[PDB]
């Protein structure tokens, strides 16, 4: 409402956050559809940024980079995290939402 | 038709239990008594209508039962024989009702 | 006690029955049973007794079951066989065509009171026992099996002319003391209520293999007569289904271990088999299938990976030699056994899931697309083995009901065009494979090949021949089911309805010969094969129908004349049934053995004739719909139709660019080739090869069926309208 140019940017972001992929259970939860739709969501964010309804602003571009997973931006945002376990949970939330103990150690390292 | 579904489940029970015909016959009597108690002896015509419509519903259900099974099996021969007897029961009810209602209205029209 | 037992069973199981009257034998058996129940229901020791006495009771009820069966072969009283009977009012068993009169006497002889009270004795002895005695209770379950064995009944025959018995193998009567005692014992079961079935459920879930089999058989026979479903209600309430279905995750992992070279012992396979049989018992109930669907069983199966691995060979590598045990079947066969129960439960749920069959078929098609690779391999595999024929038959059973574009129109809606196109491309793969199935196995040379494949062993060769023949019959019936569903679905359309075949009898003539039997000839299934297949299959089916009709009639004559046959023919029949016979055995036993052979063969031929009539009438439907499409709607290239040349062939055209290549081109599936010269040549060829003899054969054959599904005549409509369309050309 305040920024006319950023209003479209905010609407696109709000639409993306409204269409966050969630669990898929038809009697048993399906991780496959889960990662597929998350990847498609990442693709949609990239296409929004390329179309410019999700770009052209430093904050929005940084947010899209973080959503796709951007280590240097997170490490610059080390203030808002302040903790490496928060770093770990952000990394997993933004690149590997379905983690196994076999890779938890790699990601923690 | 739900009646088809109750036919399926009662036939699932009825294959492990008695023939459908005897159960169908026995199911009618409570309706007989309900109609007789709820209705007077001057509304005999509506009472006959009650018998007919309900026992037509039982014909409906019983042919629904017998139609799906193999009729070339002698298991259903006795049930079907009882069934043709049921249709003869229709025709007997219809015949008596028609003759005696005709007699009543003829006594009325004897002017 | 060990010695006294061993003594009595040596008295029983090994000694000939003939030396002493069986009346006295069974009398003494029940007397011993009542006295031992007295002593041990009153107890004579502590836990140390239940194992030994439980094995005792095991073998005692075994011997009593088979001994009562020995009486079941002999009449007692003054009449148990012959013209007149006057003792059948004493039991729920009554007269029937040969076989049941001797059985009814065996129970009219015995005091049902004693039977019922002694089984009460058993059950009360059971119920007072506590837990932790799994092998004791195993003896107990087996003892119950041995008793109810006597009360068990076999499957009914399959008759067409109705000339042999179909009674007293079931409970369909207020009578059938079998059924009434079953109802009483059902009441006693429910009197035991939650605790007893708690015990049996825990014993079936975590017990030992043998005891698991005993419990499963007990449950199956109890459920086969239960009409009150307390068991279903309680097991649903308790969530045992939840732990059981979650145990299939462990089944997946163990079977994934078993597929590796040198698999461990078959006990895990037996365990999975027993679990699957239990789930089949569950799916038998409509409500049970409802809860199975509600639980997302197919979703769990799809998430499992075991069916994704299939033992398949290559022309290269170490393939051609197995490192698995030679006493166990091929790993490919083991995987077939692995995948089979999932397909069986799928076909059961699709059949019985009519209300939610939308979701059932959606999950089923998810299963198929997940396992399409193995499914495609089986579809494209030409084997000729019984196992492969069963594979294809059950695959078609799934596809004919599941792989419908209507299911994609009703579910999966709103998905992306990429998902839509992938799903429909797989669907089209399934239609093309189904079409190629008729080209592969609609030929007649398969008959000679399979008739010759079963001459290695003649004891089971007859059964093998019947099995492959029936398997082909269901495959034909079933691809026709798929086609009929598709045609009924596409019926309301008038611009998107295409016919799968093109009109020609050149291929009709060609198929009557060999298919260059090194690779089975297939008409191009991406290029729309011809109605010559339909007409050739129909003519072959008519010929074989007269064949099996006449042999069935003769077999029925033999079955009714079995009383009049001399010793030698019946001896031959008994030898053909089991490798023991001759005239040293009883004439009645010989008659029964011959009649049982005749019953099974009559059942086979009856099923054959019925389904063959099915394919015949559905061929009529195919001919009708093709004639309707071609003679009324297809554009002709020799002239301008009044309003039909503006009507394109069924379905719209691809916008994707492809080159016409002689392999896997669905773009060719969209065009029919129709011309007036084609119409004239087709009409003349039909008039000549579709003889009035064939028409009269169809009409007289179609004068006894359609009674089972009881819908008004469509058969004469199809025959007459096909006849008219044959005489009616393009408008």
UniProtKB/Swiss-Prot annotation, chain A:
Q: Where in the cell is it found?
A: Nucleus, Nuclear pore complex; Nucleus membrane
Identify the domain of life: Eukaryota
- Assembly, per entry: Component of the nuclear pore complex (NPC).
State the family it belongs to. Belongs to the nucleoporin Nup85 family.
Q: Function, please?
A: Component of the nuclear pore complex (NPC) that seems to be required for NPC assembly and maintenance. Involved in nephrogenesis.
- The protein here is known as Nuclear pore complex protein Nup85
Native species: Xenopus laevis
Gene that encodes the chain? nup85
């Amino acid at each position: 409402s305040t920024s006319a140019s950023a209003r479209s940017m905010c609407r696109v972001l709000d639409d993306l956050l409204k269409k966050m992929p969630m669990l898929h259970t038809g009697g048993t939860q399906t991780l496959t559809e889960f990662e597929l739709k998350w990847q498609h969501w990442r693709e949609e964010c990239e296409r929004h940024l390329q179309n410019g309804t999700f770009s052209s602003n430093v904050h929005m571009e940084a947010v899209c980079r973080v959503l796709l997973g951007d280590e240097e931006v997170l490490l610059e945002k080390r203030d808002l995290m302040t903790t490496w376990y928060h770093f770990l949970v952000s990394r997993l939330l933004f690149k590997h939402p379905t983690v196994k103990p076999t890779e938890l150690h790699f990601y923690a390292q | 038709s739900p009646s088809f579904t109750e036919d399926i489940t009662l036939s699932a029970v009825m294959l492990q239990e008695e023939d459908p015909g005897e159960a169908a016959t026995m199911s009618m009597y409570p309706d007989f008594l309900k109609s007789f108690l709820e209705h007077p002896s001057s509304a005999v015509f509506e009472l006959i209508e009650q018998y007919e419509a309900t026992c037509n519903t039982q014909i409906t259900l019983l042919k629904k039962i017998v139609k799906r099974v193999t009729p070339g099996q002698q298991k259903f021969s006795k049930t079907a024989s009882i069934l043709w007897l049921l249709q003869q029961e229709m025709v007997t009810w219809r015949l008596i009702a028609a003759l005696y209602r005709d007699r009543i209205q003829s006594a009325l029209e004897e002017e | 006690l060990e010695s006294w037992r061993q003594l009595v069973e040596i008295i029983l199981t090994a000694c000939p029955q003939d030396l002493i009257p069986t009346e006295h034998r069974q009398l003494i058996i029940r007397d011993l049973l009542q006295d031992l129940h007295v002593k041990i229901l009153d107890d004579d020791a502590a836990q140390e007794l239940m194992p030994i006495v439980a094995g005792a009771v095991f073998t005692l009820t075994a011997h009593l079951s088979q001994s009562v069966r020995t009486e079941l072969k002999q009449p007692m009283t003054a009449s148990g066989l012959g013209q007149s009977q006057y003792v059948q009012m004493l039991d729920g068993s009554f007269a029937a065509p040969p076989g049941t009169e001797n059985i009814s006497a065996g129970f009219a002889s015995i005091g049902d009171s004693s039977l019922h009270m002694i089984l009460r004795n058993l059950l009360e002895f059971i119920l007072k026992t506590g837990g932790g005695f799994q092998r004791v209770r195993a003896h107990l379950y087996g003892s119950l099996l041995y008793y109810l064995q006597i009360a068990q009944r076999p499957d009914e025959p399959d008759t067409l002319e109705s000339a042999h018995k179909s009674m007293w193998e079931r409970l369909t009567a207020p009578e059938d003391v079998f059924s009434k005692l079953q109802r009483d014992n059902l009441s006693i079961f429910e009197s035991y209520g939650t605790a007893l079935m708690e015990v049996v459920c825990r014993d079936a879930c975590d017990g030992h293999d043998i005891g698991r089999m005993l419990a499963l058989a007990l449950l199956d026979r109890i459920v086969s007569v239960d009409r009150q479903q307390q068991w279903l209600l309680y097991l649903s309430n308790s969530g045992y289904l939840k732990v059981l279905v979650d145990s299939l995750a462990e089944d997946d992992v163990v079977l994934r271990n078993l597929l590796t070279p040198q698999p461990p012992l078959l006990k895990a396979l037996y365990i999975y088999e027993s679990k699957m049989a239990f789930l089949t018992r569950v799916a038998k109930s409509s409500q049970g299938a409802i809860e199975l669907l509600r639980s997302g069983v197919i979703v769990r199966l799809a998430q499992c990976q075991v069916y994704d691995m299939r033992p398949e060979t290559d022309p290269h590598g170490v393939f051609g030699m197995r490192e698995t045990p030679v006493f166990i079947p091929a790993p490919v066969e083991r995987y077939r056994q692995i995948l089979l129960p999932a397909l069986q439960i799928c076909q059961l749920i699709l059949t019985s899931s009519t209300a939610q069959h939308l979701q059932a078929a959606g999950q089923v098609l998810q299963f198929l697309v997940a396992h399409s690779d193995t499914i495609q391999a089986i579809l494209r595999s030409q084997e000729g083995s019984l196992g492969s024929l069963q594979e294809l038959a059950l695959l078609t059973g799934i596809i004919s009901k599941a792989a419908l574009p209507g299911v994609l129109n009703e579910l999966d809606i709103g998905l992306n065009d990429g998902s839509m196109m992938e799903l429909q491309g797989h669907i089209g793969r399934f239609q093309r494979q189904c079409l190629a199935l008729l080209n592969r196995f609609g030929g007649s040379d398969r008959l000679r090949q399979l008739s010759l494949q079963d001459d290695s062993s003649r004891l089971d060769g007859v059964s093998k021949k019947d099995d492959m023949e029936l398997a082909m019959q269901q495959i034909c019936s079933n691809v026709m089911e798929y086609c009929q569903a598709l045609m009924i679905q596409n019926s309301p359309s008038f611009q998107q309805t295409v016919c799968l075949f093109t009109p020609s009898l050149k291929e009709s003539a060609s198929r009557d010969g060999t298919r260059q039997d090194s690779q089975v000839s297939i008409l191009p299934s991406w290029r729309l094969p011809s109605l010559g297949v339909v007409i050739h299959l129909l003519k072959q089916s008519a010929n074989n129908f007269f064949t099996y009709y006449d042999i069935h009639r003769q077999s029925v004559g033999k079955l009714q004349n079995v009383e009049q046959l001399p010793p030698d023919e019946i001896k031959e029949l008994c030898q053909s049934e089991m490798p023991v016979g001759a005239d040293k055995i009883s004439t009645t036993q010989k008659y029964g053995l011959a009649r049982r052979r005749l019953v099974k063969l009559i059942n086979s031929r009856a099923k054959l004739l019925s389904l063959c009539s099915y394919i015949i009438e559905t061929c009529l439907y195919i001919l009708w719909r093709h004639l309707e499409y071609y003679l009324l709607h297809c554009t002709t290239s020799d002239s301008q139709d009044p309003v039909f040349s503006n009507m394109t062939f069924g379905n719209r055209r691809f916008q994707d660019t492809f080159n016409t290549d002689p392999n896997m081109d669905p773009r060719n599936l969209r065009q029919n080739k129709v011309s007036q010269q084609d119409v004239d040549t087709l009409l003349r060829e039909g008039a000549n090869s579709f003889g009035e003899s064939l028409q009269k054969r169809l009409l007289d054959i179609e004068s006894l069926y359609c009674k089972v599904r009881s819908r008004h005549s469509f058969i004469q409509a199809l025959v007459r309208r096909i006849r008219g369309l044959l005489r009616v050309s393009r408008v």
